[PDB]
């Protein structure tokens, strides 16, 4: 996967066509001077813009996109449908033909819906799946067949969440699906490999959080950790790895000391901690662990 955010704001792959099948080619960001977004607006490379025509998401839209025309008379930019840009725990964009819905546990509507407010709702009620539709509608369930009506292109799930216009909240007859583990404040992991996100992900992390996750893989000689996303604002915001047996703090990362791409810990049992101050919020993190025997 090349995205660990819900809107692919961290995408830096090389897709330069709005779609791999029947797509249009992107314009180069170092040529897009009619347009708001270009390399003269963002020197320093902000948003991943540069001397390329790769799909990017610099303006906090719901998904990577690119310019497809030089003059903005008609349709001049388009979302990119990038297969590898699907955060782990986003199960995809699915069709919802009405009766029954794809998720049959419970549901609500909110004028402030976000991805997490929906996830959080579902999780609280002990459902494994949460699905956003039409920007404002949250459905929850344990039905395995949330795909009952079929997959859709990710771009048909790009209505803005009514409570956060940086996030995708499905569409008309379209439901974007998430594992309710996503953004949980704690959890226990024993898969060989998985991803753990900050609390409230993909919303920004709330203030005053203390959260931990156990990672425990019987047999493992080591666990390799990488931080494909690390957007932690404050010095007093912290991500910590503990030895699971001894509780010793193996590494501390904060807003002024970032993690390596990656590192190894030779334990089979680790505790990830996150602490959030009451000052500034940010997108948070995604940690990917792969255990090795």
Q: Which residues of the chain form contacts with Ca ion (CB under 5 A)?
A: 233-234, 237, 277, 280
**Is residue 279 near its own copies by the rule CB under 8 A?**
yes
Contact, 227 vs 286, CB < 8 A?
Answer: yes
Q: What are phi and psi of 86, to 5 degrees?
A: -145, 105
**Is residue 25 near ligand NAG by the rule CB under 6 A?**
yes
**Is residue 207 near its own copies by the rule CB under 8 A?**
yes
169: left (phi > 0), else alpha (psi -120 to 50), else beta? Answer: alpha
- SS3 (DSSP) at 13: coil
Query: Which of 42/212 has CB closer to its own copies?
Result: 212
Contact, 16 vs 80, CB < 8 A?
Answer: no
What does the alpha-carbon distance between residue 194 and residue 293 come to, in Å, rounded to a whole number? 16
Contact, 265 vs 222, CB < 8 A?
Answer: yes
CB of 253 to its own copies, least distance (A): 13
List, in sequence order, every beta strand (DSSP E) within 121-268: 129-133, 137-141, 160-161, 164-168, 174-179, 187-189, 193-197, 210-216, 222-231, 238-243, 249-254, 262-265
**Is residue 134 near ligand NAG by the rule CB under 6 A?**
no
Contact, 114 vs 182, CB < 8 A?
Answer: no
**Is residue 224 near ligand NAG by the rule CB under 6 A?**
yes
**Is residue 28 near ligand NAG by the rule CB under 6 A?**
yes
Q: Which does 263 bind (CB under 5 to 8 A by kind): ligand NAG, Ca ion, its own copies, none?
A: ligand NAG
- SS3 (DSSP) at 145: coil
CB of 260 to its own copies, least distance (A): 21
CB of 188 to Ca ion, least distance (A): 19
Angle at 176 between CA 103 and CA 156, to 5 degrees: 125
Query: Which of 105/183 has CB closer to its own copies?
Result: 183
CB of 65 to ligand NAG, least distance (A): 15
Query: Which of 105/202 has CB closer to Ca ion?
Result: 202
Query: Which of 77/274 has CB closer to its own copies?
Result: 274
Q: Which does 235 bind (CB under 5 to 8 A by kind): its own copies, Ca ion, ligand NAG, none?
A: its own copies
CB of 280 to its own copies, least distance (A): 8
Q: Using CB under 6 A as the criterion, which residues of the chain lie in contact with ligand NAG when the complex forms?
A: 14, 16, 25, 28, 30-31, 51, 53, 224, 262-264, 292
């Amino acid at each position: 996967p090349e995205c660990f955010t819900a809107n692919g704001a961290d995408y830096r792959g090389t897709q330069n066509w709005t779609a791999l099948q029947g797509g249009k080619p992107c314009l180069f960001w170092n040529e897009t001077f009619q347009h708001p977004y270009n390399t003269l607006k963002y020197p320093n490379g902000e948003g991943g813009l540069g001397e390329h025509n790769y799909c990017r998401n610099p303006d906090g839209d719901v998904s990577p996109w690119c310019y497809v025309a030089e003059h903005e008379d008609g349709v001049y930019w388009k979302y990119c449908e990038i297969p590898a840009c699907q955060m782990p725990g986003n199960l995809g964009c699915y069709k919802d033909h009405g009766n029954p819905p794809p998720l049959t546990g419970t549901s609500k509507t909110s004028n402030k819906l976000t991805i997490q407010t929906c996830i959080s709702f579902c999780r609280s009620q002990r459902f494994k799946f949460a699905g956003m539709e039409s920007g404002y509608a949250c459905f929850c369930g344990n039905n395995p067949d949330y795909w009952k009506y079929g997959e859709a292109a990710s771009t048909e799930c790009n209505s803005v969440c009514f409570g956060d216009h940086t996030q995708p909240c499905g569409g008309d007859g379209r439901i974007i699906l998430f594992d309710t583990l996503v953004g949980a404040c704690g959890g226990n992991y024993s898969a060989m490999s998985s991803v753990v996100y900050s609390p409230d992900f993909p919303d920004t992390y709330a203030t005053g959080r203390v959260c931990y996750w156990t990672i425990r893989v019987p047999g493992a000689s080591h666990i390799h950790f990488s931080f494909p996303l690390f957007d932690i604002r404050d010095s007093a915001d912290m991500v910590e790895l503990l030895d699971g047996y001894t509780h010793r703090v193996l590494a501390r990362f904060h807003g002024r000391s970032r993690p390596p791409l990656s590192f190894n810990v030779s334990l089979d049992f680790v505790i990830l901690y996150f602490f959030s101050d009451r000052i500034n919020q940010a997108q948070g993190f995604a940690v990917l662990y792969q255990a090795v025997k």
